[PDB]
Amino acid sequence: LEPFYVERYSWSQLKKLLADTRKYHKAPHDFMFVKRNDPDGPHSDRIYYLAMRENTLFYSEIPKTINRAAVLMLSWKPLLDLYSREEELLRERKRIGTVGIASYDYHQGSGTFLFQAGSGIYHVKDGGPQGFTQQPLRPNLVETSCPNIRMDPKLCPADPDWIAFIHSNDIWISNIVTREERRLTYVHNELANMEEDARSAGVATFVLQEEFDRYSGYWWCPKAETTPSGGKILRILYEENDESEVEIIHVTSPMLETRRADSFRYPKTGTANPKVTFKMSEIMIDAEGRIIDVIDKELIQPFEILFEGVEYIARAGWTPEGKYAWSILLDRSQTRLQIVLISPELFIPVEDDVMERQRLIESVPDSVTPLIIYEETTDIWINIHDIFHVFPQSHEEEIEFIFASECKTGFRHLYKITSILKESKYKRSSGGLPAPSDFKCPIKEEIAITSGEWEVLGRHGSNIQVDEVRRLVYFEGTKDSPLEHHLYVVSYVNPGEVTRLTDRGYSHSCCISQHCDFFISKYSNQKNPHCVSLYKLSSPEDDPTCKTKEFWATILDSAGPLPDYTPPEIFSFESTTGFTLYGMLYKPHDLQPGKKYPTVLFIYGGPQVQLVNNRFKGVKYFRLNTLASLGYVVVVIDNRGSCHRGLKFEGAFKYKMGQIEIDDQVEGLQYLASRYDFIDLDRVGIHGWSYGGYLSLMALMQRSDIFRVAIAGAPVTLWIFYDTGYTERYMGHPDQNEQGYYLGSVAMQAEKFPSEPNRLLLLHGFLDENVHFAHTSILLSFLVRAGKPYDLQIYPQERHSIRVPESGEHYELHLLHYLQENLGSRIAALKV
Amino acid sequence: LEPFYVERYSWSQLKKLLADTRKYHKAPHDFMFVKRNDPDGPHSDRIYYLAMRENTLFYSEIPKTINRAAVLMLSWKPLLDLYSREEELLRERKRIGTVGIASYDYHQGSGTFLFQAGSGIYHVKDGGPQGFTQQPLRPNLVETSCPNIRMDPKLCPADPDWIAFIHSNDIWISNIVTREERRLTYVHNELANMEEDARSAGVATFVLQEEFDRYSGYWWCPKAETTPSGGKILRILYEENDESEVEIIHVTSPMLETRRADSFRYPKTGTANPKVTFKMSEIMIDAEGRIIDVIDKELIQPFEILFEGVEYIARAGWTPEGKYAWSILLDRSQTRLQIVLISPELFIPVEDDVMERQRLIESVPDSVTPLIIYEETTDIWINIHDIFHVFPQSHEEEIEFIFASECKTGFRHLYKITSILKESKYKRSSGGLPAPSDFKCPIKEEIAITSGEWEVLGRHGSNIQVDEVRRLVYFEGTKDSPLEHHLYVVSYVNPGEVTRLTDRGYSHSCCISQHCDFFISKYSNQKNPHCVSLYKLSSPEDDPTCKTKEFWATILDSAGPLPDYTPPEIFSFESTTGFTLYGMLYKPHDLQPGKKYPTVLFIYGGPQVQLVNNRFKGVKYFRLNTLASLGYVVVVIDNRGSCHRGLKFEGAFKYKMGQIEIDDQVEGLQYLASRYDFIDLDRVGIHGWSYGGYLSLMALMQRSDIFRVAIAGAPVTLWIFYDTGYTERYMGHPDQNEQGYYLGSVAMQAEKFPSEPNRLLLLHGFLDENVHFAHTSILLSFLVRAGKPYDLQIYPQERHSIRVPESGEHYELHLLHYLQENLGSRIAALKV
Amino acid sequence: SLRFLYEG
Amino acid sequence: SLRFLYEG
């Protein structure tokens, strides 16, 4: 064999290349099905959705029949007629790259939409009693006396005139009709600096937004209780955080000319999280919709007693009929989940006068108590999801609900549960701390809906749509393959045959109608881009379990296979570790016989993430293919730790992060290198971002033999610097894993790095709030004093993201030039 | 002419080369002469000094005779018997990087030494009435109840029992025999933090320390006034700064683990400096030695009224009698110096009660006023120096003194002025403010003592010594050459002849015995390292105007020319500008003829510094020899704007920094290339630190054609980020030099950088508080977004200095390897 | 997450 | 003063 050398292009030339391949370049989302209720009309439903180059509410008409010779192309009608810190941070937390309207709220009975475009909060009406428009609607600005920006606006389900929002970390409730506005929480003074003012109501802490993808801390109660005179009592449940005790970090201010730092709260691993607790506002109203009064209530006992051991409010909300408010609750180590009903009778008014408090406590019965309706444990971890469905209350002594759990089988499946709401043994009157089991409820039934060596999908907007009429439950899953996410359906009363609805060979992300008679699917594969098509469901007269599917219309046709993009082929191997580890291979374009090629290995292979599966890798992973075309082999492997393959697989690196990963990357690279005589193993490079950059550094530290060069992007060089929500989940408290932390921290092992230059390259966003720049700066400090070289590049306008276009152009240009000059080209192998 | 290429070594090899050329690797200072008054003894004087492993007080004996055949090496006697943030910064601002005793304070009358050493403050008595110890003394710790470090101790010259120090920015006094301790000022609150509390007493602000080498802010009155009762009054003048209006800058914290940044006050160019005043503390001591009471005192009128136009307090102190306290005062633009006498009768008690404060002001007469004894302007700038010498009061009407000034001729010279202390026309009583001239004293005569095309030295402990019996003045000067600093002497009564007391062939730094009958010189040339020797002064019997010297003793013998070390050749050329610019040529070792070599140009060529003179450049600039040891031509040039070549030469870049300097570095570099054809121009590198790195960046940005690589150490990318005291001095207020700033700020013209890589390297201390790291990180912001490449190196444990040895080791290695791989070696010229 | 966001 | 400190 003979080595192939890629073409030495100049910096200016490589920029022309990357400029021109870029020269030609998001689908719709947040669908909602609203019935037209037109006896005489052609259309059954009307769908609404957000689409993009701005991002606005569209609608499209759904016809009762279709011509089955032709493809109905659904036409897009626009519903709408034409940065703060609180936004730009949230946009980082939500990982939302594109500007416009990120989401919206809607009230069924009225028709009221509610959404936040720019600084403004707006509302429009369509779909309700007030009809269906045939032209764009002009957005109604919700007006305010609030100085700063307003976040997280939500329609009250009970009265759609009222809305709430956050303002300077406090809750407010403007009325879209009376224009009455009121501050419901007086917890945080907007003027007083953060160092001495850390309380905040209705908001999700940094950790809950970053690590538990929960972006809100208040939940409107769906029903309104009537008053004697004629008004009504609304309710908002909220989380009151006190971040007083949490660490204060300094991250560089984006305005580099100021040369100052923003102080924000970062629960470093092993330190304390904020002092969370529950609370509830009782908004009293008269018949006129005027606010009579607002009583603000608190738990009858501390949160540390009633929810003993709870360190996180992962999710929360209300039961369908507003009777109890519920809450999903993790212990600190995140191995013990709970599901706790919380009666509004637990909350009593706040009182300064000491003997009025005393009185109010005794008016509350002993029988009122937190009802823990489910508890689960594990020796790996809970993965929080959005799945939870509570059925209406059949019997007043019980609560039927569906939930998902990895904890039973080792894989995530659906379980129907009836819990019995027992009067708790514990009686507050006697005065004492409840026993470890005093609030637990008996489980009457627990019927596993699904089961097997595959998982149901709950993260990232996958959920369940439950048909409470036919008594079915729809769900995405990995049953047909780990590489394809498909829609399924099954009875929740007589569990049995699961029925796949989506077509084989693709990876779908469905959004089933609230009426369960339709479902949309954004699908693609390795070859084709992502079409979005509508599909109609049908029960045969003789058998409601059997749902059959028929293509109805196309919402968005695919572009078609991109010209000048050879996709990769999706390989596997039997691992020495007893698993079928999957990988992706970009063969170099226009291969030569008898010539070995320089190999680049892209990587992430960390938790919550699969890279290797059947989807179009032309959008985001475009350059992997541009690389290949220039003459690099490109490999991608999902080491043990990747998602969508069960808990025990994901758990393999627990307490052990960075120690098992490269073993699999090399394993697959060697399995490949035997079969593929064109793979030059002497010239392997590696590169990734975040956990990717972490492993790239590990790769070079451990396996100088396999990897010639490593390019680490915003890497974790030190676990004592990351946050609680993540590191404790996967590595635990630093005292309970003294040795895993040290082995998993590359900056502690700086002397292990290679004394050859032109091998380590560090990239980092300088304003990185998440993976703080310190990680790089301290790695460098210890490198400097261990006497090892590095090449560094900083992206000063950036965070845990690349958002400025010219910053991303530079990253790409440089990485290619670096790869050329130190791996691929003939001058690179000369240097050695 | 065939090109020579350097030997390509690996990282690990170069490390070993550098560590072995380092294999084989500090002189005395702060000398004081004290007579023995021992007619029967063998020694006339005993000298004390600081010397170096730590740095302590030593002493030596000066014999009344010497065996003039032999050389006397003087025996070194130990006098003594063996960091905070405050210290860490003071050390940075003073450019001291030598652990030990920095300086001391001696009281002639008693023998009392007083020196801070570590945390503590110590004293020992030796060489007063109470004999001369023949053996090391035990340091006597001054006890304290202060919890924090005591900076800036000073002996009271009136009473050796009393000392003062600074502690948490307030002035304390401690009695070294009655143990009494007392806080005199309550201006700062040690428990208060940065942003809120920003006043301070007895302290020099950042700008005064970094830009006017003035570190102390309080001045003991040299004489004590007597009370009726038998007691006395002791006085202390001091600066009271308020830094509330100064901008606040976040510099990164050295504890990288904390991931935080220290806040401190940086008077950016164009922003506010501290608003300042004078104050006075009268300490009434009783006959016993106890403090009866302390009275704090404010000026009778506001500072900006009495001292109209004054922005900075350059220097201050008292007259030998103590009647007035003097002060040298600059306006903001530093083109107006004024020596002003300030009588204690100008100060009144601080009084909050307004009926008493009215009555105090009226009690002080209108006749008591500040007296501007001298004032001068320039069209370039005022270089402040440590020269100013007041003579005793012959007549009560006047004051005689020697001051130095560049305004008169364009060169710094000695001028014995005699001013008259007229009663000002101003009358407070009247009510209005003073007219522009109302405090200008008339000059009875301004005799010039020296004058020529050369300067007297007044900074860095060069000064004047004054024989008042013989009516002479010893000073240091450039009269023989700008390349050699020599000790000269001259009569100030009838001036004229100027006898040089040092020997030609070397540059000297000299202390002169306070008795004027001895002098020490630290002396070196380009070839021989620094020695220190002691010469005996003497006059012929027939004319005490005339002086001569004789070698008495060696103090420090030199090492003898360092081995394997080739000193450079000092060269010169009559430039296009009409100034004889100088340089230093390092020819490569073992010149293989018929060849040409890569050329590294080293550079500073900013103000206040002459790189090229007749001094040994083998300690500090050791590596400039190593670079030639590997086959790099090394060149240094003193372009226009350097010091020791007159003022108008230094004024060349006024309002024009960055513009004029490279044109001389290129001109001289070409001159050399013609005569010395071993200079390959196709491969010329440039490198420097601070202003050096600034012009490294200018070189690359202005002359892509001349300079292949430029390596820029902590560069001034952007001028607006630099302090007032420097920038405004050399470039002016930003509003009034808009264009000069744009051109001088290379952060602006990022577009003008090379689109090739491996040409620009940026080096910076991460914790740099002077040339803030934001200089580098903002240039990088713009280089990215202007499409250009860079190479970056950071030293996370370094400020505006490299102090960790491991950090320096890495730097030199990186620099050697970088020049090798991108300039000097064969692989380098292939890469293009 | 430990998860960047670039979209080329 | 744009004047770096280093000794080696």
Side-chain angles (χ1 to χ4, degrees), chain B residues 390-589:
Chain B
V390 164
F391 295 100
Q393 210 151 66
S394 69
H395 326 314
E396 185 179 321
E397 323 319 289
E398 299 153 38
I399 184 178
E400 277 183 23
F401 66 96
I402 288 155
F403 187 70
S405 175
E406 295 186 303
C407 304
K408 306 281 114 290
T409 62
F411 290 76
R412 194 195 334 286
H413 287 289
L414 300 175
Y415 299 76
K416 175 169 147 283
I417 311 164
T418 314
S419 301
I420 308 160
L421 308 188
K422 173 184 162 190
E423 170 169 314
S424 294
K425 317 176 189 188
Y426 186 81
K427 259 80 168 58
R428 273 181 276 286
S429 165
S430 306
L433 318 186
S437 276
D438 285 338
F439 307 142
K440 286 198 77 181
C441 281
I443 307 299
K444 199 165 78 67
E445 47 148 45
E446 176 169 5
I447 297 171
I449 302 156
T450 62
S451 38
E453 300 281 275
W454 56 271
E455 68 182 32
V456 180
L457 312 186
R459 268 297 210 95
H460 312 122
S462 300
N463 210 295
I464 70 171
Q465 183 58 33
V466 178
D467 207 316
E468 289 181 31
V469 177
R470 294 163 208 274
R471 311 205 280 175
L472 292 169
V473 51
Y474 305 83
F475 62 93
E476 292 182 55
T478 57
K479 192 170 96 88
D480 280 51
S481 157
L483 317 189
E484 290 171 8
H485 302 199
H486 286 295
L487 184 72
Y488 301 87
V489 53
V490 62
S491 171
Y492 64 76
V493 168
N494 256 222
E497 276 284 306
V498 179
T499 329
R500 162 160 50 79
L501 307 183
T502 48
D503 299 337
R504 287 218 66 164
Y506 319 121
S507 188
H508 307 246
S509 175
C510 309
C511 177
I512 314 92
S513 179
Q514 71 202 267
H515 302 266
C516 315
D517 78 320
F518 264 117
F519 79 88
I520 299 166
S521 166
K522 183 193 293 98
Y523 62 91
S524 88
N525 53 4
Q526 202 53 254
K527 283 272 281 290
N528 307 336
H530 54 283
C531 323
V532 178
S533 294
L534 164 81
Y535 305 95
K536 178 149 203 182
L537 288 186
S538 284
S539 297
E541 70 152 303
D542 67 294
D543 182 36
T545 301
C546 196
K547 282 273 181 157
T548 64
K549 51 146 259 199
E550 177 178 28
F551 179 91
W552 211 248
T554 304
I555 293 177
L556 185 75
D557 235 304
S558 163
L562 232 79
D564 70 72
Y565 176 89
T566 299
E569 288 189 341
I570 298 177
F571 71 88
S572 79
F573 64 98
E574 307 286 337
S575 161
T576 48
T577 49
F579 293 120
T580 315
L581 303 181
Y582 291 85
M584 284 198 292
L585 182 60
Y586 290 90
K587 302 173 204 284
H589 304 70

Side-chain angles (χ1 to χ4, degrees), chain A residues 39 53 92 149 312 370 377 524 550 588 601 612 626 821:
Chain A
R53 285 279 81 182
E92 283 295 327
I149 192 169
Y312 296 112
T377 67
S524 82
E550 166 159 44
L601 170 54
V612 181
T626 294
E821 289 294 307

Side-chain angles (χ1 to χ4, degrees), chain A residues 95 210-211 604 608 690 722 802, chain C:
Chain A
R95 253 60 153 190
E210 175 51 32
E211 307 298 351
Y604 177 73
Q608 308 155 300
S690 197
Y722 211 64
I802 285 165
Chain C
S1 192
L2 270 177
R3 199 160 143 196
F4 213 62
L5 179 72
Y6 182 60
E7 308 190 288

Side-chain angles (χ1 to χ4, degrees), chain A residues 462-748:
Chain A
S462 283
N463 219 293
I464 57 168
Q465 186 57 46
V466 163
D467 196 335
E468 294 188 0
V469 188
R470 294 159 214 284
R471 311 215 300 182
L472 310 170
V473 51
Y474 297 71
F475 65 102
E476 294 165 55
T478 70
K479 187 164 91 78
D480 270 50
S481 189
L483 316 197
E484 290 169 22
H485 296 216
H486 287 295
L487 182 56
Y488 302 96
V489 52
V490 58
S491 174
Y492 71 74
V493 178
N494 271 115
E497 188 214 350
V498 175
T499 313
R500 178 169 52 81
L501 295 160
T502 43
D503 294 359
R504 288 233 66 197
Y506 296 142
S507 193
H508 312 253
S509 187
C510 315
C511 189
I512 310 140
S513 173
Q514 71 189 258
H515 303 84
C516 293
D517 61 347
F518 272 115
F519 78 79
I520 306 180
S521 164
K522 177 215 270 190
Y523 55 82
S524 82
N525 83 85
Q526 212 57 240
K527 289 275 277 278
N528 307 156
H530 47 254
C531 271
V532 176
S533 303
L534 180 75
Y535 297 88
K536 180 158 187 169
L537 301 175
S538 276
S539 295
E541 63 181 21
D542 68 78
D543 179 22
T545 322
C546 175
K547 291 284 190 152
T548 44
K549 161 198 85 100
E550 166 159 44
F551 177 106
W552 204 246
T554 280
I555 289 165
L556 159 58
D557 282 313
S558 275
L562 163 58
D564 314 316
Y565 167 79
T566 319
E569 59 183 51
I570 313 150
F571 76 93
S572 66
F573 51 96
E574 291 322 294
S575 185
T576 54
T577 70
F579 283 126
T580 303
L581 294 179
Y582 295 99
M584 298 199 308
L585 180 55
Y586 294 76
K587 304 189 214 260
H589 299 187
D590 187 46
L591 266 159
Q592 292 315 310
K595 294 197 174 192
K596 60 188 170 183
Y597 282 78
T599 307
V600 165
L601 170 54
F602 195 81
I603 186 169
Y604 177 73
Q608 308 155 300
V609 174
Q610 166 163 83
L611 305 172
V612 181
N613 61 335
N614 195 0
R615 299 185 197 177
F616 190 62
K617 307 283 169 182
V619 172
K620 187 155 163 146
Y621 303 89
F622 177 54
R623 298 311 199 173
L624 298 189
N625 161 269
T626 294
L627 261 177
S629 77
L630 298 154
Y632 296 96
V633 176
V634 181
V635 179
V636 175
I637 303 179
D638 274 342
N639 63 47
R640 295 191 310 294
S642 74
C643 70
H644 310 318
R645 295 203 57 184
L647 184 64
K648 312 289 160 187
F649 182 106
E650 200 185 34
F653 56 21
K654 190 179 190 201
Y655 313 108
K656 293 168 203 196
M657 285 176 140
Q659 298 168 58
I660 73 163
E661 283 82 320
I662 298 307
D663 280 17
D664 300 2
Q665 298 295 309
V666 175
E667 178 165 32
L669 207 69
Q670 265 149 14
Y671 161 95
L672 281 174
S674 68
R675 285 162 144 72
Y676 297 92
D677 62 292
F678 64 68
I679 294 177
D680 193 340
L681 292 184
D682 274 316
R683 293 183 294 160
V684 181
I686 186 160
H687 166 67
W689 289 92
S690 197
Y691 213 101
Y694 177 45
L695 297 173
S696 298
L697 298 174
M698 288 291 184
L700 190 65
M701 183 190 74
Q702 301 162 11
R703 309 306 302 283
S704 306
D705 59 348
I706 271 55
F707 308 95
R708 275 292 308 160
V709 300
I711 305 95
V716 173
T717 71
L718 221 61
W719 288 110
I720 68 168
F721 279 17
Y722 211 64
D723 63 66
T724 54
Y726 194 89
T727 325
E728 305 200 337
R729 197 205 317 256
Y730 303 119
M731 306 290 280
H733 214 274
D735 299 324
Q736 275 85 254
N737 187 12
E738 252 196 70
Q739 206 184 16
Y741 271 57
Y742 160 66
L743 296 159
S745 290
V746 289
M748 229 88 83

